Paper text:
With this, we term this turn-β-turn structural motif as the ‘single-stranded DNA Bridging Motif’ (sDBM), and suggest that it is the main binding moiety responsible for recognition and conformation priming of ssDNA by Rep HUH-endonucleases.
We present structures of two 10-mer bound structures of inactive PCV2Y96F (1.93 Å resolution) and WDVY106F (1.80 Å resolution), and one 8-mer bound WDVY106F (2.61 Å resolution) structure. The pre-cleavage state was captured by mutating the catalytic tyrosine to phenylalanine. All three structures are in complex with the divalent cofactor manganese. A comprehensive table containing BASA and contact values of each of the three structures featured in this study is also provided.
Numbering used by the authors: 8 to 53, 57 to 111, 113 to 127
DNA sequence: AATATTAC
């Protein structure tokens, strides 16, 4: 039985290559009930993988482990599944994934929130 | 969970 109940989410999509911008744009509508405040999306192309950090205005309660899955819009139309965690420190997470980044592979939206 | 071994 899986439950993530948090305002702040650290997503990881292994073996995933989605352009960070489209991952950001569609995760923003998937999460729109929780009013996303800030989103950062970083593709790492050295095990190719996505990291996403999401700061919402309301505590998101996620109980469907597939609710955030993403599908390519071209062949082979693969489902991409994330590790979904509550972020223990948004500053540490942000630091981790932006350090992992070229600035071509990054996508931000909104104003970063200074958690307390 | 459920990608996968990536994930503060
Ligand atoms: Mn990484
Ligand atoms: Mn870890």
């Amino acid at each position: 039985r899986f439950r993530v109940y948090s305002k702040y989410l650290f997503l990881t999509y292994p073996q995933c290559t989605l352009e960070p911008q489209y991952a950001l744009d569609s995760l923003r509508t998937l999460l729109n009930k929780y009013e996303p405040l800030y989103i950062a999306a970083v593709r790492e192309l050295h095990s190719p993988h996505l990291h996403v950090l999401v700061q919402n205005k309301l505590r998101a309660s996620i109980t469907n482990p597939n609710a955030l899955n993403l599908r390519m819009d071209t062949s082979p139309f693969s489902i991409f599944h994330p590790n979904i965690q509550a972020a223990k420190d948004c500053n540490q997470v942000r630091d981790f994934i932006t350090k992992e980044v070229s600035d071509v592979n990054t996508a931000e939206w909104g104003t970063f929130v200074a958690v307390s």
